[PDB]
């Protein structure tokens with residue numbers, strides 16, 4: 245009744261959420277499950293997260309296509325032959341066709357209480373909102389943008405926090421919920 | 432400075448939030464303010480909330496919505512009774528009547544809604560918020576604009592859904608309701 249969970253993490257730039265998932269999951273044993281990241285993927289060679297991945301003995305598989313369907317076909321290919329049981333989108337800034345979403349079990353992190361504040365400007369719009377609560381969400385990746393089945397979400401009270409303090413709470417709640425997210429899926 | 436905040440409370444049924452308002456605010460003095468519910472109004476004569484009001488010595492004005500042909504004539508009578516009560520703020524606590532501009536343009540009012548607005552507007556919030564794939568839910572208090580359930584939000588609280596049944600989910604909802612509504616009224620007057 246034991247499990248070795250192989251994970252793939254996709255990124256396009258910084259490598260923050262990528263590095264946070266490694267420290268808490270890569271080859272770490274948590275409960276009855278053991279986890280390892282078998283794939284780190286990037287679409288831009290100049291991204292810094294590649295050298296961040298090299299800090300865990302993890303080489304990174306590297307707008308180079310005029311065809312999205314042809315591009316996503318390679319993503320699916322790499323994830324599958326890695327043996328990854330789950331793909332985790334971490335700062336991956338690209339639009340994924342059904343070529344990916346129909347054939348890859350993937351999860352994504354969103355800095356808002358879905359389905360509220362979908363899209364990029366979630367943190368900004370949620371702070372300026374007259375709502376008094378905010379949070380972060382983890383959901384499955386579907387054909388519907390940020391509309392996949394919600395896995396987990398945590399809510400907090402905005403109060404008199406400045407935008408800096410508010411944003412720092414979101415980025416902290418993310419680093420909590422996202423590594424935790426993978427765990428619940430297999431427990 | 433010590434104003435006498437007059438409150439009008441509108442309800443339709445059990446009156447749990449009404450009773451909770453009375454228990455925390457009626458003839459009670461918090462901070463600089465001394466609150467007094469000067470009107471309890473219901474549109475149903477058989478509502479149990481009337482009995483809860485009697486404990487505090489308050490009679491409930493009954494305005495049967497079936498006794499009037501239009502929502503407007505029904506509303507003009509609500510207005511006059513709130514006006515002739517001298518209330519400073521009208522609190523909608525389980526008041527299940529749509530309100531025409533006759534009310535909304537003339538009465539300064541707030542409303543309690545058992546969901547995290549602007550999500551789950553309407554009278555099926557608790558059931559929809561439970562069946563939803565969302566892992567959090569809660570309640571909201573908002574000003575009463577012309578837009579149904581769309582007024583400016585003044586208070587919100589959330590709880591994690593986790594593993595509550597709908598019976599337990601509903602309890603937690605009404606639990607937060609009883610806490611957040613009287614606090615909202617206090618927050619407005621400080």
Ligand SMILES: [Cl-]
Nearest residue numbers: 352353354363
């Ligand atoms: Cl996103």
